[PDB]
C-alpha cells in the first residue's frame, strides 16, 4: 500500500483519487492519501472551489517512484513532484500517518471497479500519449487538445492519441473503397491492431485511458477518441471473439461508472445507436446493451 503526501492545502479544492473525491478547506491540515493499491495506474485530480473551470490531474504508478503534491502559488496549482531521497520521503510519510493527517484510499474489498476501468492501461503507454519525458507521471486537464484536433495548436501540451479517420487513405485501400468504408475489418485488424497497436491489449489501453480523461476532466478530444475506437470495432464484420467479449466488459464498467448527470455531454447518440442497433456487432455486446437500455434509454 503506497502514499502520496501533500506539503499543504493552501487553497480550497475538491481532490479526486481514481473514482473517489474529497472536499478540502483553505489551509485545512491535509497531508495526503495513503493505502493506495499497488498494481494499478492511478489519477489524482483537482477542481478549485473558486474556479470550477479547469479540472486537472496526474496519472502515476507508485511502483515508478515516490510522488508528492505541493501547491505552487505562482502557477496557482497543485503540482505532482518526485522525491528522489527515499529516507526523507519515508520519514515525511511516517510523521503524517502518525499524526493521521492523511485520507485512506477507500477501496471496498468486493469492489473491482478501478481494476475493470484500468485493466489494459499501462503508465509506459500513458507517457507516449502525454509527452513530458523528464517526469514519471503525466499531467492532463480539461482544455488539452489532441493531435487529431490540432490538424483540423501547441504540440508540447497535446494528447498524442492514435489518429483514427474513417475517410482517410490509411482507412481505405485503393479499389476496395466501398468494401473498406462499410466493413472496417481491414482498418481494425491490419492497419491498427497488427500495424500500430501490435495487440488488442494496447488498443484497449488507449480506449480505457481516453474514456477516463473524458470522464475525469471533461476532455472533449478524449471523448472523441473513446467513441472512434468503439465505432472502429463495432463497424468491423471480422473481430476476434475474445476482443468482442472483452470490449463488452470494458464498456459495461465505463457506462456503470459514468455520472448519470453527464450522460448528455459524454455519450454520442449516433455512435451508441449505430453500435448497439445497426453495426455488425449489434448482437455482440449483451452486457453493454443491457446497462445502456436500463440506465440511458433516453439516449437510444
Amino acid at each position: 500500500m503506497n502514499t502520496v503526501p501533500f506539503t499543504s492545502a493552501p487553497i480550497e479544492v475538491t481532490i479526486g483519487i481514481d473514482q473517489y473525491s474529497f472536499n478540502v478547506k483553505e489551509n485545512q491540515p491535509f497531508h495526503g492519501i495513503k493505502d493506495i493499491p499497488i498494481g494499478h495506474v492511478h489519477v489524482i485530480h483537482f477542481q478549485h472551489a473558486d474556479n470550477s473551470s479547469m479540472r486537472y490531474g496526474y496519472w502515476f504508478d507508485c511502483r515508478m517512484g515516490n510522488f508528492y503534491i505541493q501547491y505552487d502559488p505562482k502557477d496557482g496549482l497543485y503540482k505532482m513532484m518526485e522525491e528522489r531521497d527515499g529516507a526523507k520521503f519515508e520519514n515525511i510519510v511516517h510523521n503524517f500517518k502518525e499524526r493521521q493527517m492523511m485520507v485512506s484510499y477507500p477501496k471496498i474489498d468486493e469492489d473491482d471497479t478501478w481494476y475493470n476501468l484500468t485493466e489494459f492501461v499501462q503508465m509506459d503507454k500513458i507517457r507516449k500519449i502525454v509527452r513530458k519525458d523528464e517526469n514519471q507521471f503525466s499531467y492532463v486537464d480539461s482544455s488539452m487538445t489532441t493531435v487529431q484536433e490540432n490538424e483540423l495548436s501547441d504540440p508540447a501540451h497535446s494528447l498524442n492519441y492514435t489518429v483514427i479517420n474513417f475517410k482517410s487513405r490509411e482507412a481505405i485501400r485503393p479499389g476496395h473503397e466501398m468494401e473498406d468504408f462499410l466493413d472496417k475489418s481491414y482498418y481494425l485488424n491490419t492497419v491498427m491492431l497488427q500495424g500500430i497497436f501490435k495487440n488488442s491489449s494496447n488498443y484497449f489501453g488507449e480506449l480505457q485511458f481516453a474514456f477516463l480523461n473524458a470522464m475525469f476532466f471533461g476532455n472533449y478530444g478524449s471523448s472523441l477518441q473513446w467513441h472512434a475506437m468503439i465505432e472502429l470495432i463495432c463497424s468491423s464484420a471480422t473481430v476476434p471473439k475474445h476482443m468482442l467479449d472483452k470490449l463488452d466488459e470494458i464498456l459495461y464498467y465505463q457506462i456503470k461508472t459514468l455520472p448519470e448527470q453527464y450522460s448528455d455531454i459524454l455519450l454520442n447518440e449516433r455512435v451508441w445507436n449505430i453500435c448497439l442497433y445497426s453495426s455488425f456487432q449489434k448482437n455482440s455486446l449483451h452486457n453493454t446493451e443491457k446497462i445502456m437500455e436500463n440506465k440511458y434509454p433516453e439516449l437510444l
Binding site: 475517410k167 482517410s168 487513405r169 481505405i172 473503397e177 466501398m178 468504408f181
Partner: protein, 237 residues
Amino acid sequence: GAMNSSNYAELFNNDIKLFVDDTNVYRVTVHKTFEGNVATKAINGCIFTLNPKTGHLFLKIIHTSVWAGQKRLSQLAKWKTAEEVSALVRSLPKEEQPKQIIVTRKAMLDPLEVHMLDFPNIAIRPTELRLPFSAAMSIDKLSDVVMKATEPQMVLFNIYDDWLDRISSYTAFSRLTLLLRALKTNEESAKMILLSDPTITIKSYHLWPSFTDEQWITIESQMRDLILTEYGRKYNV
C-alpha cells in the same frame, strides 16, 4: 457547403465544376413471377455528369451486366457512380479536372468523398436546389443511346446544343432546368410542345429543336404554363 438559391451565380464562374446525378444509374421494371411473387428486371442506366458553364455532358452508360450477382443494388449504385466519376476525373488532364463536384442527392456525398481521397483539393458539395436531372431519360437521343448499349460506354454531348453562341450559361442553364422540369411534370405535354410544329427540326448533332430566339420565348412560355397547371391539379389550388 451546400449549393442554394443564394450562391446560384457560382455555377457560371470560371472555376471548373460538375453536377453529378445518380437517379438513373439503377433502373428496374417491377413484375409478377409465375408463382405470383414480385421480381425486378434491371434495365440500362446512366450517370448524368454535367458542366453547367459549358454544357458538356459526360453520359456514362451503366449496362445491366454490372449488377449481375451483386446484392444491395441501390447501395452499390451510389458506389459504382462514385467509382465512375473518380475514373472520369483521373482520365481528364489536370487543367480540365473540376475544382468542385456537386451531387444532386446527399447519399452520394460519402461514396464520392471516399473515391476522391486522392483529390483532397476537389470540394464535394450537396445542393438544396431540387434539380430535375432525373428527366434526362425523357430526352429521346439520350434515352436511345442508353437503351441500345450492349456494354459499358461513355458518350459525350453538349446538352445546350449551340445556345451558348446566342445566350449566357446562366440563361442556358435556366432554359435546360425549365425544359427538364416540364418533361418531369408531364412528359407527354412537354414533348407535344417541343415537336408540335414539324417545320422546326432537331439537327443530327443536337438534342433539342432549332428554335429562333422568338420561338424559344414562346416555347419557354408554354413550359411555364404546363408546369403551373400541373401544380394546381397536383394540389387542388
